Amino acid sequence: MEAAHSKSTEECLAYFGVSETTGLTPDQVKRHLEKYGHNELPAEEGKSLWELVIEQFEDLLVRILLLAACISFVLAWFEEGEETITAFVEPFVILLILIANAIVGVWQERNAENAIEALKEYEPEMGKVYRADRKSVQRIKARDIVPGDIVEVAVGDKVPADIRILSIKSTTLRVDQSILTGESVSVIKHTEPVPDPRAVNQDKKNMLFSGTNIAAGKALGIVATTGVSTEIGKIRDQMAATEQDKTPLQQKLDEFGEQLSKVISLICVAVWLINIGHFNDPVHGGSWIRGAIYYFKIAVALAVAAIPEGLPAVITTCLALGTRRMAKKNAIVRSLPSVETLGCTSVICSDKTGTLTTNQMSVCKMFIIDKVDGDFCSLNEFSITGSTYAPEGEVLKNDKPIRSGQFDGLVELATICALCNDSSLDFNETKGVYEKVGEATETALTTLVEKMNVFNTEVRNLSKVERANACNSVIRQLMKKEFTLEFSRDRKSMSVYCSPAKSSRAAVGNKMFVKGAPEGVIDRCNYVRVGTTRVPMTGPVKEKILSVIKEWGTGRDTLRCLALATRDTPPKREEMVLDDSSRFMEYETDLTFVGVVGMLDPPRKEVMGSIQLCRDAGIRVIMITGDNKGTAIAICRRIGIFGENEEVADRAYTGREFDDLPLAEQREACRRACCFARVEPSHKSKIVEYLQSYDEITAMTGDGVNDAPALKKAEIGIAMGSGTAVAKTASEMVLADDNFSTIVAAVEEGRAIYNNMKQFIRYLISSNVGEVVCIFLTAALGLPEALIPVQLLWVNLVTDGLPATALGFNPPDLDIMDRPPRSPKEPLISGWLFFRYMAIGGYVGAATVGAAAWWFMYAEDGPGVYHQLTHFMQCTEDHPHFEGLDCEIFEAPEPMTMALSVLVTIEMCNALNSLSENQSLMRMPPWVNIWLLGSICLSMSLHFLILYVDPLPMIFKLKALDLTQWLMVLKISLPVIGLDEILKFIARNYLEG
Numbered sequence: 001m002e003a004a005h006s007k008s009t010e011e012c013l014a015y016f017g018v019s020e021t022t023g024l025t026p027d028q029v030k031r032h033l034e035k036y037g038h039n040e041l042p043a044e045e046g047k048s049l050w051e052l053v054i055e056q057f058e059d060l061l062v063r064i065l066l067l068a069a070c071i072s073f074v075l076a077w078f079e080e081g082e083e084t085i086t087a088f089v090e091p092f093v094i095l096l097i098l099i100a101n102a103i104v105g106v107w108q109e110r111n112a113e114n115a116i117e118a119l120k121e122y123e124p125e126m127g128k129v130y131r132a133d134r135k136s137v138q139r140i141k142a143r144d145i146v147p148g149d150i151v152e153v154a155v156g157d158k159v160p161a162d163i164r165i166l167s168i169k170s171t172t173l174r175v176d177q178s179i180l181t182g183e184s185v186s187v188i189k190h191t192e193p194v195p196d197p198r199a200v201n202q203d204k205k206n207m208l209f210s211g212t213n214i215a216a217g218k219a220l221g222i223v224a225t226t227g228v229s230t231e232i233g234k235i236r237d238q239m240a241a242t243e244q245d246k247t248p249l250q251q252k253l254d255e256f257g258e259q260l261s262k263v264i265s266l267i268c269v270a271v272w273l274i275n276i277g278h279f280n281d282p283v284h285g286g287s288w289i290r291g292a293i294y295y296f297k298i299a300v301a302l303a304v305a306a307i308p309e310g311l312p313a314v315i316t317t318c319l320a321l322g323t324r325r326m327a328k329k330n331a332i333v334r335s336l337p338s339v340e341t342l343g344c345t346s347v348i349c350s351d352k353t354g355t356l357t358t359n360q361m362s363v364c365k366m367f368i369i370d371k372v373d374g375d376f377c378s379l380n381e382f383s384i385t386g387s388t389y390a391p392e393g394e395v396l397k398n399d400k401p402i403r404s405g406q407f408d409g410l411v412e413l414a415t416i417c418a419l420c421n422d423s424s425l426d427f428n429e430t431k432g433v434y435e436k437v438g439e440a441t442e443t444a445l446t447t448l449v450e451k452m453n454v455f456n457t458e459v460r461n462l463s464k465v466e467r468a469n470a471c472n473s474v475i476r477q478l479m480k481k482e483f484t485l486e487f488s489r490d491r492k493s494m495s496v497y498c499s500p501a502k503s504s505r506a507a508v509g510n511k512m513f514v515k516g517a518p519e520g521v522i523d524r525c526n527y528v529r530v531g532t533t534r535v536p537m538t539g540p541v542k543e544k545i546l547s548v549i550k551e552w553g554t555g556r557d558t559l560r561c562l563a564l565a566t567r568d569t570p571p572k573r574e575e576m577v578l579d580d581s582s583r584f585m586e587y588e589t590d591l592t593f594v595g596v597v598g599m600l601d602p603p604r605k606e607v608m609g610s611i612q613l614c615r616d617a618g619i620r621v622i623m624i625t626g627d628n629k630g631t632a633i634a635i636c637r638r639i640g641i642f643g644e645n646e647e648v649a650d651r652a653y654t655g656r657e658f659d660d661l662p663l664a665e666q667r668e669a670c671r672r673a674c675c676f677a678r679v680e681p682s683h684k685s686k687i688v689e690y691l692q693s694y695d696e697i698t699a700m701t702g703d704g705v706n707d708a709p710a711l712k713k714a715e716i717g718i719a720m721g722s723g724t725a726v727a728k729t730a731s732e733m734v735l736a737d738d739n740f741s742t743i744v745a746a747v748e749e750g751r752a753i754y755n756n757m758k759q760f761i762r763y764l765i766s767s768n769v770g771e772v773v774c775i776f777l778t779a780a781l782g783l784p785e786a787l788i789p790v791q792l793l794w795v796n797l798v799t800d801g802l803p804a805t806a807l808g809f810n811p812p813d814l815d816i817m818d819r820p821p822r823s824p825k826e827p828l829i830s831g832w833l834f835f836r837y838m839a840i841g842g843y844v845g846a847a848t849v850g851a852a853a854w855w856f857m858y859a860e861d862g863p864g865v866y867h868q869l870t871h872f873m874q875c876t877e878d879h880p881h882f883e884g885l886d887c888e889i890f891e892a893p894e895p896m897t898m899a900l901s902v903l904v905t906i907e908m909c910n911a912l913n914s915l916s917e918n919q920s921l922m923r924m925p926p927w928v929n930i931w932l933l934g935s936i937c938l939s940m941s942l943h944f945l946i947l948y949v950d951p952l953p954m955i956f957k958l959k960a961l962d963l964t965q966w967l968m969v970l971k972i973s974l975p976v977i978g979l980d981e982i983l984k985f986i987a988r989n990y991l992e993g
């Protein structure tokens with residue numbers, strides 16, 4: 001019964017045709033179970049290792065290499081040469097690399113925390129119902145509760161279903177529903193209907209929600225919904241349904257794979273256009289089984305040339321290091337890819353209570369009467385420092401610290417706050433921080449009178465453990481609390497009867513101490529306390545009182561106020577009915593007003609400056625709270641989201657207000673409003689979706705269950721360290737130290753990481769660009785010499801990998817937090833850099849293919865002189881022309897080493913070319929990245945151990961002496977620096993000119 005909250009208890013009982021006294025009959029339970037299922041949330045296992053690994057290989061660039069792995073086995077079947085028996089390793093090499101790049105992906109998916117599992121911690125195993133078969137209450141499994149049966153809850157219980165309250169047995173029922181509102185303050189339910197169909201949870205004061213827990217009371221209700229249909233179940237579905245998109249750079253890599261499967265698959269099928277050479281390339285034969293292999297021989301190589309294999313190995317070690325660095329800045333990053341996505345954060349969404357605020361109620365201000373002379377009234381207003389439940393902070397008057405004992409009015413104010421109070425302050429010794437016991441509102445009063453120290457107790461050298469209640473205990477000594485008139489909704493106050501118990505028995509006078517909502521409490525005050533004396537409450541006096549209350553209840557310091565009053569002559573205890581709470585208001589009559597305390601859940605101190613740093617970095621901060629719009633707006637102005645006098649009508653909304661906008665208007669409201677309050681969890685989810693409809697990389701910061709749907713929908717969920725298990729489970733990063741500042745720290749880290757990532761991606765691709773140029777040129781020449789499919793992998797995996805990874809340690813930009821967030825949808829290579837790598841690509845593609853032709857054209861030892869070299873496939877048959885040379889020499893060791901030597905040296909230089917884009921090396925020192933110089937040496941160190949340690953050069957081929965070969969590797973390997981330099985000089989100076 002969804003719209004139960006808007007219907008009457010009788011109506012809700014009629015809906016399921018159930019008596020409030022008997023409950024559901026056995027058959028009803030049978031039918032309701034069949035119709036509504038079981039009261040539980042469906043679990044979500046997710047991972048099937050088989051289905052997950054088959055998801056790993058559905059990537060295109062691995063599907064092609066996989067395709068290129070089996071095709072390479074076909075290149076192991078020919079029996080033409082003795083080397084073939086050792087050439088079976090070549091498909092095996094590529095396969096185990098596809099396995100390495102596959103394990104590491106699984107290595108990152110293993111730590112999938114189960115959000116639903118964390119969330120299902122909030123469903124109790126048991127539940128108390130009333131059914132027809134028994135008069136006594138039955139304690140049953142909560143999953144066996146159907147809509148429509150009478151349910152019972154009391155203190156401590158975890159609400160088992162979404163329940164419409166029928167009868168409240170206590171004078172009040174008080175519920176903790178932070179699960180759905182993120183607010184720990186206990187809310188006082190009733191049973192009257194809540195007519196608004198579109199009411200949010202915060203307005204459904206006649207409902208109990210599955211997952212929330214009873215802070216106080218005992219009530220009876222009827223189940224409205226169970227299972228998936230409850231409010232917590234809507235949190236569940238959204239958590240299951242939110243599928244995480246891919247990283248902006250992973251998106252850029254995927255479009256690179258699609259275009260690769262285009263240009264490659266259209267090159268190999270365009271070679272057929274130049275089969276003019278295979279018209280009579282045999283002496284009399286044609287194309288057969290052995291001869292058409294050359295078309296797939298150039299296909300398996302063209303694939304490994306374009307694929308930047310080993311790049312994922314580079315980026316993965318890069319991210320793991322950043323994870324460590326951010327973990328030192330107290331940013332614990334659970335997902336490796338979100339390290340980079342963090343750098344382009346456009347908009348940070350943030351919860352208020354517990355995220356931006358300490359979630360510890362604090363008394364900011366207090367006032368007592370100062371003087372009353374006729375129509376003139378003055379007050380002693382004070383303020384109190386400290387943003388937590390600790391008894392730390394001092395009272396001050398006009399920004400100057402003050403001791404409250406000198407104000408007789410403040411002594412009685414502390415006495416009421418300590419005695420009219422069902423709550424205490426515990427120092428959790430394990431956490432090392434003071435915690436509350438009972439209501440936050442009341443603990444605020446406890447922690448207050450500890451700061452005040454009205455009797456000047458020596459509290460400096462106490463133990464932190466018994467500092468907690470040290471000053472309250474002194475007040476408990478002065479007056480014995482006899483009984484309590486509990487809070488009731490009719491009077492919005494509570495009071496406490498007391499006796500002195502020392503000097504001469506109770507011959508000093510019994511007294512009642514009262515706190516509550518100001519208006520109602522003040523109206524029952526006939527006198528006013530001025531220090532020790534009392535005077536009659538008059539028109540001018542109370543207006544002065546109300547006035548300053550109104551000023552505090554609103555505006556820049558929107559506080560909750562409690563009026564504090566005493567009854568100096570309380571009725572005789574034996575003429576007071578303590579059962580009927582309807583009688584308690586007349587007992588709290590003819591009172592002496594004392595003072596007023598103004599309460600607030602204050603901001604964390606690190607916030608306001610963190611916000612400004614986000615502002616300086618072009619990052620918008622949007623508060624999204626389930627707390628009242630008044631309070632949120634008030635916090636935004638201290639935080640600096642809003643200015644102190646800034647007009648906010650158009651830029652703060654409640655969820656209900658937001659739902660009332662046309663869909664169009666809702667999307668732009670997200671673009672201009674920085675405050676959303678009194679929201680249900682789906683709202684935060686929906687607001688992030690709207691911000692992502694502007695292609696804005698958005699984060700979400702929270703600490704509660706109610707934050708989880710948005711924590712998932714955001715590109716980045718950020719969980720408070722002290723936050724809930726379910727919020728951390730849903731987040732990509734956790735703030736270990738609860739510092740909102742460490743978000744700014746993490747952005748600057750991920751910002752500087754994404755910049756270095758672009759480099760070694762460009763550097764790896766610019767290599768693949770030239771490597772593809774190399775193979776295509778060889779095929780057009782008819783010369784397959786000077787390149788091997790197996791050689792390409794090793795170089796990309798190691799020779800290019802190590803400088804690539806070294807480019808990850810580049811010194812970051814100085815004014816890096818002064819730039820706006822990176823645009824999401826621009827390519828790494830686009831305009832002149834395309835030309836720069838397209839030229840340098842073909843220029844290093846021809847330096848490798850030209851390395852063969854030179855060896856055949858001219859060499860001191862190699863080889864001596866011509867064109868028939870292109871027709872080397874005819875050394876076998878047409879031998880009379882190939883005179884003076886053996887036929888085996890065309891696959892000689894030396895020419896392939898040169899093309900590898902220039903490929904290594906060039907890429908050793910293009911690595912320096914990619915130390916920076918568009919800045920000289922004479923101005924950007926290669927030694928500014930000491931790691932980069934290390935990588936270049938170790939890559940060539942492996943290249944000199946690749947040529948001089950027998951097994952390696954056996955595959956790869958012989959090495960040729962320095963004096964006659966290293967002369968020629970520097971034909972382009974060093975001009976490619978000059979070339980890139982010159983092209984770099986152009987885009988830097990000729991651009992603006």
Ligand SMILES: C/C=C(/C)C(=O)O[C@H]1C(C)=C2[C@H]([C@@H]1OC(=O)CCCCCCC)[C@@](C)(OC(C)=O)C[C@H](OC(=O)CCC)[C@@]1(O)[C@H]2OC(=O)[C@@]1(C)O
Nearest residue numbers: 252253256259306765768769772773827828829834837838
């Ligand atoms: C060998 C690999 C590729 C990708 C390639 O060459 O094709 C173009 C191509 C499709 C792109 C181009 C390639 O341009 C060339 O043609 C280079 C010369 C080689 C020609 C082939 C035969 C000799 C990239 C590779 O060229 C350079 C100069 O690197 C740049 C860029 O790549 C990126 O932005 C990197 C993505 C992480 C892409 O325009 C890209 O198209 C896209 O959608 C992007 C956004 O990918």
Ligand SMILES: Nc1ncnc2c1ncn2[C@@H]1O[C@H](COP(=O)(O)OP(=O)(O)CP(=O)(O)O)[C@H]2OC3(O[C@H]21)C([N+](=O)[O-])=CC(=[N+]([O-])O)C=C3[N+](=O)[O-]
Nearest residue numbers: 185186187188439441442487492493494515516517560599
């Ligand atoms: N933002 C806030 N700041 C401080 N205290 C708050 C608070 N919100 C609630 N409380 C305290 O949390 C309770 C939540 O009620 P409830 O049904 O959520 O009510 P409302 O938010 O006022 C109506 P609404 O739904 O439109 O937002 C309230 O009870 C007492 O203080 C309140 C109280 N009093 O309010 O008068 C008096 C009191 N004594 O002893 O007189 C004690 C309160 N208390 O909380 O212990």
Ligand SMILES: [Cl-]
Nearest residue numbers: 628629630678
């Ligand atoms: Cl509101």
Ligand SMILES: [K+]
Nearest residue numbers: 711712714717
């Ligand atoms: K997320």
Ligand SMILES: [Mg+2]
Nearest residue numbers: 182353354704
């Ligand atoms: Mg919160």
Ligand SMILES: [Mg+2]
Nearest residue numbers: 627628629631
């Ligand atoms: Mg409120």
